[PDB]
Amino acid sequence: DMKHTVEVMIPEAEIKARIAELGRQITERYKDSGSDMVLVGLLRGSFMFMADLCREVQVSHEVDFMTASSTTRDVKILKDLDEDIRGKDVLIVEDIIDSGNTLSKVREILSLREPKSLAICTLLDKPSRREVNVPVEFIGFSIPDEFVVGYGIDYAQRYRHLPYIGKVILLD
Amino acid sequence: DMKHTVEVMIPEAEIKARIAELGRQITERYKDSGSDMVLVGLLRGSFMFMADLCREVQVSHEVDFMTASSTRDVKILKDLDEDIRGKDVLIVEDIIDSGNTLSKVREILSLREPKSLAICTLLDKPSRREVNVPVEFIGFSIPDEFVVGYGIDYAQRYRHLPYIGKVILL
Amino acid sequence: DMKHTVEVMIPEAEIKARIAELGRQITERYKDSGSDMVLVGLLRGSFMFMADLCREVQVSHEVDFMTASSTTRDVKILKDLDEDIRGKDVLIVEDIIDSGNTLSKVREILSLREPKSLAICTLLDKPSRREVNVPVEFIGFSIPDEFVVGYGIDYAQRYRHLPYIGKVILLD
Amino acid sequence: DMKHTVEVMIPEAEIKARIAELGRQITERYKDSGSDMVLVGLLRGSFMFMADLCREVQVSHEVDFMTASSTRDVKILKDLDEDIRGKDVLIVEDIIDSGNTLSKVREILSLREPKSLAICTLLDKPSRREVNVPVEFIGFSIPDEFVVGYGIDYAQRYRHLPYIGKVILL
Ligand SMILES: O=c1[nH]cnc2c1ncn2CCN(CCO/C=C/P(=O)(O)O)CCP(=O)(O)O
Ligand SMILES: O=c1[nH]cnc2c1ncn2CCN(CCO/C=C/P(=O)(O)O)CCP(=O)(O)O
Ligand SMILES: O=c1[nH]cnc2c1ncn2CCN(CCO/C=C/P(=O)(O)O)CCP(=O)(O)O
Ligand SMILES: O=c1[nH]cnc2c1ncn2CCN(CCO/C=C/P(=O)(O)O)CCP(=O)(O)O
Ligand SMILES: [Mg+2]
Ligand SMILES: [Mg+2]
Ligand SMILES: [Mg+2]
Ligand SMILES: [Mg+2]
């Protein structure tokens, strides 16, 4: 609840072009696999990324969602997957990777269900804040240490509906 | 699951154009409210529709989701993350049909006393209606066809199609 | 996290005797009903009350649980019922009624599913704190305006395992 | 559901006496820990066992529950309310059997890095074992009988029985 403004960091056209490329890369890697494929989105902030990405993934797959959230608290599952992922190619879809804490644990949890393969695709990556070494196979943008909003990403539950990635700039 | 094929019914160009008009309507309806706004999507089928629609709504709003049980009781597998009391709420569904689940969800959310409560569905099947629930914003009125795509699935398939396709049985 | 002590308000034997009586009353009211019966416990604090009460209810019924919780926030469902309650005699089982806010909303939610009948059984009632008129058909004890612990009821996640109802007394 | 009847296998007197001994064992094991303790019950079948057991544990602990999906994937319908990192955790189940669900639940909880992780089951069926999961505290070892009562159900019936009964088919 602080006075601020929003400046564009990644224009709408830039995102669409990038996701189009991500789609080609993901398609190329999973096109020859004989197993089923699942895209797992991490609610709440990844609904928009998922919607645009899966339309660019030219491979027959399923779409599922799970909801997790963390002083230093445990990563708990508020909403689990609807479908089973055992023996399937699973691609986790996240909006942004900050410290890597949450996504590290989520990958550990899903790995217990023994999928055929397990990979991560995040739209934004903020490497300056990384605290845990987590392998990310697909990254849309590596971004500076700014607090970003838009495209499903929020600031105090605000600005999710923005078609672009903006950065919050404080005043005073 | 049966031997089948899928052909285009509503191209993504026509879906995009229709959602643009929906966004203008919603914006017109809620611009001068003053109260906080929130779009509530019913997972899973409404995630893609939500992503495109909320980008066409030129009004400051929040985005939330809930997952309902899908006769049997409508139970909540995942509730909303935020409150809706005193807010303008627009329920976002992929397809209204029998009216059952959407009628129960509206009743549940009404108990939390929001300022207003409306429903926006991408597809509507007027014929299959069993409960007369009011829908304010409808994308397409379709006959009783087996449709997939744009979040709508058939045995967990075709959710990721950018278009609304019709399933042809063989 | 304040220095305190715990004094007995309702001894273990007093509770057991009271629940035994509650069991007789509940049995008498639902023994002649031709429909199925469900006892719905509100997690987390009502697990112990439920366990002792249902053993005193001499009527063939089911046991289910749901988890709800509320400035002035909405009552949300964190865990819903496993089974359907439509056309069934439903008895809500709660540990304690303070303001009545939560239980008022929960009763409204369950009523939407159109059960044959809907009633509330709480172990403790604190009438001095009531803010909403909610009908409670069965009450174990009406208690003074004390902060109670034990028998599933906690203070900072502590003292749930106490076989008696105690009251927290602050020091200094 | 079939035509049947239920007779007593383990009277509530013997259940109570056994849980008293379990409480002494658990108390002995965890008295000098110093770290926070928490009993985790697997709903629904373990609520009655939890209520009687935790009252017999003379060590300051917390009480939590989780609900797991019950081959198919073990999914979490309801997670724990509190954290278990650095704490002594005792999973409380009504009956260990094939070992499947309890093995997965233990793996999931282990990721949260608790100080210790043990399992306490009221009933054990050694014969039906498919996954060798270590159980530290066992109430009764029983043969492969169809048992109900004390939280254990048969088509959502007999959960409220104070005793362990055997189902006799007709
Ligand atoms: O710049 C930011 N803007 C908004 N949120 C930010 C930002 N950086 C981290 N976060 C929080 C992201 N968190 C959680 C954000 O995802 C959930 C979004 P919401 O459900 O709307 O609160 C994950 C970071 P990590 O994987 O390192 O644990
Ligand atoms: O033609 C169809 N194709 C695919 N699905 C169809 C069709 N008609 C109804 N449905 C499903 C209708 N359902 C869809 C519910 O949407 C939930 C999305 P999901 O979580 O993937 O099952 C609701 C019927 P009502 O709201 O009237 O109670
Ligand atoms: O004396 C008390 N000791 C502990 N808790 C107390 C007490 N009074 C109210 N509460 C809180 C009870 N609340 C919630 C307690 O139930 C849930 C227990 P937990 O899940 O362990 O936090 C309900 C009161 P109302 O129906 O008026 O909304
Ligand atoms: O003889 C039996 N009577 C009734 N139930 C029985 C019996 N054997 C196993 N079960 C069920 C075993 N289940 C019980 C799981 O408990 C969950 C309680 P609920 O939520 O009521 O289904 C687990 C088997 P495992 O842990 O080895 O994977
Ligand atoms: Mg995220
Ligand atoms: Mg739908
Ligand atoms: Mg309560
Ligand atoms: Mg069990």
d(C-alpha D28, C-alpha A39), whole Å: 48
Strand C62-69 with B76-78, pairing? unpaired
d(C-alpha C17, C-alpha B169), whole Å: 66
Decide whether any atom of ligand 4 lies within 6 Å of the D124 Cβ: no
Choose among D132, D6, B101: nearest CA to C60.
D6
Total of domains in chain C: 1
Burial class (CB in 10 A: 0-12, 13-18, 19+), A93: buried
Contact C112 B112 (CB under 8 A): no
Residue from the list A77, A84, A105 with its beta carbon closest to the beta carbon of D79: A77
Decide whether any atom of ligand 4 lies within 6 Å of the D112 Cβ: no
CA D77 to ligand 5 centroid distance, Å:
21
The first and second tokens of residue D167, run together, are 């189902």
What residues contact residue B80 under an 8 Å CB cut-off, 6+ apart? B40, B64, B65, B66, C74, C76
Helix (H) or strand (E) holding C57: none
Contact B160 A44 (CB under 8 A): no
Query: What's the residue count for chain C?
Result: 172
Contact criterion met (CB below 8 Å) for D65 and D78:
yes
Main-chain phi, psi angles of A129, to 5 degrees: -110, 0
Contact criterion met (CB below 8 Å) for A170 and A11:
no
Alpha helices in chain C (DSSP H): 12-30, 47-54, 101-111
Nearest CA of chain C to the CA of D78: how many Å? 6
Contact criterion met (CB below 8 Å) for C56 and C3:
no
* Secondary structure of A23-70 as H, E, C letters: HHHHHHHHCCCCCCEEEEEEECCCHHHHHHHHCCCCCCCEEEEEEEEC
d(C-alpha A91, C-alpha B165), whole Å: 25
Choose among A62, A134, A65, A71: nearest CA to A98.
A134
Choose among A102, A108, A98, A116: nearest CA to A34.
A116
Q: CB distance from C110 to chain D under 8 Å?
A: no
Contact criterion met (CB below 8 Å) for A96 and A110:
no
Contact criterion met (CB below 8 Å) for D110 and D103:
no
Residue with tokens 């990556």: A125
Helix (H) or strand (E) holding A21: helix A12-30
What residues contact residue B26 under an 8 Å CB cut-off, 6+ apart? B53, B56, B57, B59, B90, B120, B137
CA B133 to ligand 2 centroid distance, Å:
15
The first and second tokens of residue A120, run together, are 């991560």
Best probe residue, ligand 4, of D107, D152, D153 (max atoms within 8 Å of C-beta): D152
The CA dihedral of C75, C78, C81, C85, to the nearest 10 degrees, is 20
Contact criterion met (CB below 8 Å) for B59 and B88:
no
d(C-alpha C130, C-alpha A161), whole Å: 41
Among all ligands shown, which has an atom nearest to the Cα of A158?
A: 1
d(C-alpha A7, C-alpha C2), whole Å: 46
Decide whether any atom of ligand 4 lies within 6 Å of the D167 Cβ: no
Q: CB distance from C60 to chain D under 8 Å?
A: yes
Main-chain phi, psi angles of D52, to 5 degrees: -80, -35
Q: Is D107 helix (H, G, I), strand (E, B) or coil?
A: helix
The first and second tokens of residue B116, run together, are 């207003």
Partners for B (CB, 8 Å, 3+ pairs)? Answer: A, C
Main-chain phi, psi angles of A155, to 5 degrees: -130, 105
Burial class (CB in 10 A: 0-12, 13-18, 19+), B132: exposed
Helix (H) or strand (E) holding A12: helix A12-30
Nearest CA of chain A to the CA of B136: how many Å? 21
Atom of ligand 3 nearest to the CA of C45: 18
Alpha-carbon radius of gyration of chain B: 16
Cis bond leading into D55, ω under 30°? no
* Secondary structure of A97-122 as H, E, C letters: ECCCHHHHHHHHHHHCCCCCEEEEEE
Residue type, A75: V
Decide whether any atom of ligand 4 lies within 6 Å of the D153 Cβ: yes
Task: Using the Cα atoms of residue A120, residue A125, residue A131 and residue A137 in order, give the sign of their dihedral.
Answer: positive
Residue B136: give its domain's CATH number: 3.40.50.2020
Task: Give the range of the structural domain holding residue B114, as residue numbers without chain letter.
Answer: 1-170
Q: CB distance from C39 to chain D under 8 Å?
A: yes
Alpha-carbon radius of gyration of chain C: 16
The β-bridge partners of D37 are: D61, D88
CA A119 to ligand 1 centroid distance, Å:
19
Ligand 2: which residues within 6 Å by Cβ? B 42, 44-45, 70, 95-102, 146-147, 152-153
Q: CB distance from C54 to chain D under 8 Å?
A: yes
Residue type, A128: S
Residue D116 DSSP one-character state: E
Query: What's the residue count for chain B?
Result: 170
Helix (H) or strand (E) holding A128: none
Task: Using the Cα atoms of residue A6, residue A11, residue A16 and residue A22 in order, give the sign of their dihedral.
Answer: negative
Residues with CB under 5 A from ligand 5 (ion): A 42, 45, 94-95
Contact criterion met (CB below 8 Å) for D81 and D64:
yes
Residue C61 DSSP one-character state: -
Nearest CA in chain B to C111: B108
CA B150 to ligand 3 centroid distance, Å:
44
Residue with tokens 């509190």: D82
Strand D61-68 with C138-142, pairing? unpaired
Contact criterion met (CB below 8 Å) for C160 and C148:
no
d(C-alpha D153, C-alpha C52), whole Å: 17
The first and second tokens of residue A148, run together, are 């970003």
CA B95 to ligand 2 centroid distance, Å:
6
Among all ligands shown, which has an atom nearest to the Cα of A50?
A: 5
Nearest CA of chain C to the CA of B68: how many Å? 10
Residue type, C83: E
The β-bridge partners of C76 are: C69
The first and second tokens of residue D94, run together, are 């009504």
Solving technique: X-ray
Residue-wise DSSP of chain B: --SEEEEEEE-HHHHHHHHHHHHHHHHHHHTT--S-EEEEEEETTTHHHHHHHHTT--S-EEEEEEEE-------EEE--SS--TTSEEEEEEEEE-SSHHHHHHHHHHHTT--SEEEEEEEEE-GGG-SS----SEEEEE--S--EEBTTB-SSS-STT-SSEEEEEE-
Alpha-carbon radius of gyration of chain D: 16
